[PDB]
């Protein structure tokens, strides 16, 4: 049967023209006589691919030459260790602003390798807000400030960014990467797994200011050492070649769409349809997140009639809208609406919500 | 070339055509699920069926006993060079190594960050052409484990039988001969390897580990390197390399269809013999430096007496659709990597090419 509307939160839906391009290239990429999956990573074909992927990503996000771009394995969770291993001594302090459970996971891992100060946590109001930056009390000698830019489970997204009092800003942008323009120069490090907006799982992108590379802790595994990866242009060991190729296809296609200003407009448009449906529902559907920080990528919502949640999810799936189930601890629903989710999928969901409400009025 | 070439790359490597064509067919919509494998939730029922079948197929192929875990991880074999001593040793423990090539040497260097190392024997002095007699190896009396690289991909040295560890257990990097032949898994505490030679694309690393060795990692172990975390979450602690795992699953299923590892080994031995016999019968025109009894079935390094002709040999072979034959910078010459999926006809073409080349340049 046909392709479904896939609301999965990661891995996620990918552009159909990209998938079909990959299908067409799979057996024999451009007359090279082999698949990307069979290429030497030190061969001229693969080198062309990873170089074009880097150049395309630099163009898309406007990443200047003062920053390195690394294509790594291990997921964002590997970076939770790599960051303080590379950037801190064991007795340095990192500040965290914790706006959901991904930030909390980052804090717990960093505690192995340095000191951590959680200068603000949204937990007491169920992770529904971003703090006022002026009232944060930042540690005066902090090495860096870590945020999770888009909290995938909780639907809380930074629109503006804090200015570190000392040191530099590090952001986990896994679930909103390449969804909108970002002024990279405000950051020391931007990182994220590919598997929401830019490719399949198995590739993690690290964007790191060059003056911060080097001097990792002695216990840093070679495979977590940024200087090693940078000096070898992400080919220290065998990279995730097919994944990097797929990212390259996605980056190329985002440029063809008109770049990130255009991508942002589409994302804002389709998210507004869903949030407006929720707010106009007279409480039938509810989104807990404070309006100004509502994610364009992950939309958590509940039903006033909580007992109807299983029926909602099951009937949506019969209507080809899958993976709408929300997190264990609040229940309800989560609509993930990443760059490649078609406008028509969001419209189908909004129509289904309207009909469901009228039926269970 | 709009025909597929004979691809002698050392990793990533050639893969079976039937596997690639199955992946092509299903890439847009896997089995009416309505999405690609590349778009599936790792916590969803479709992907769970894929990873579970991949593990089941591998357990059958290798005859992995029930008391071993199978982990599908990211990071390559190089990440395991760190994860092994982090998980298995305290910081003042010792690991013994037999070093038969440069991959083992890299494992030693990384392990030193995490524990003490002892190289009992190195083949470096004879340019990595031999395996030591095992009984005379002086093992450390309290060594936690003994590490080998079962197939040294650059040097072409392959273990046929295995040493018996004295105090601890045996760990083997089988990256470049993984699923080329039967292995008595019970002889090992850990077998590991990147998928990218014999069983899949780059991005997936397999670790087969005895369950009683899991747990008790050093406090500084990253969560992503911790065997207990991966095992208790069945390799889904974080987001796994879903598509790579899928691809490995296809390869395992095809290796079972071929008749399993006894059949795979026969084919490997047969095609390797063709190439080694061509070299030995050439009256010194071609030379392999490796001692005969430990010559790899997977990677065949060889040189020309007239070394000035090596560049032409490689360029001319590539015009004849035999690519990636250049050998390592320290010895020059050539390296023919002839993994499971390398067709017999590719080895036949190279041998015929070698014959013609010698006749022409004799
Ligand atoms: C915002 C965020 N951060 C980190 C992660 C962890 O990424 P990975 O599974 O690649 O380790 C996720 C995964 N959903 C995420 O959404
Ligand atoms: C025997 C062996 N061990 C380890 C490695 C390193 O593996 P990776 O690039 O996946 O880290 C290689 C790669 N050629 C290898 O051949
Ligand atoms: Na201090």
Swiss-Prot record, chain A:
Subunit details: Homodimer.
First-listed, main subcellular location of the protein, grouped into a coarse class: plastid
Protein name: Phosphoserine aminotransferase 1, chloroplastic
Species, as recorded: Arabidopsis thaliana (Mouse-ear cress)
Activity modulation comment: Inhibited by high concentration of cysteine and by 3-phosphonooxypyruvate. Not inhibited by serine, threonine, valine, glycine, tryptophan and O-acetyl-L-serine.
Annotated residues for binding of pyridoxal 5'-phosphate: 76-77, 102, 152, 172, 195, 237-238
Cofactor: pyridoxal 5'-phosphate
EC number: 2.6.1.52
Expressing tissues: Ubiquitous, but expressed preferentially in light-grown roots and shoots. Detected in root meristems and in root tissues surrounding the vascular bundle.
Biological process annotations from GO: L-serine biosynthetic process
Gene name in the database record: PSAT1
Source domain of life: Eukaryota
Inducing stimuli: Up-regulated upon necrotrophic pathogen infection.
Full-length numbering of the shown residues: 72 to 430 of 430
Record keywords, A-Z: Acetylation, Amino-acid biosynthesis, Aminotransferase, Chloroplast, Plastid, Pyridoxal phosphate, Serine biosynthesis, Transferase, Transit peptide
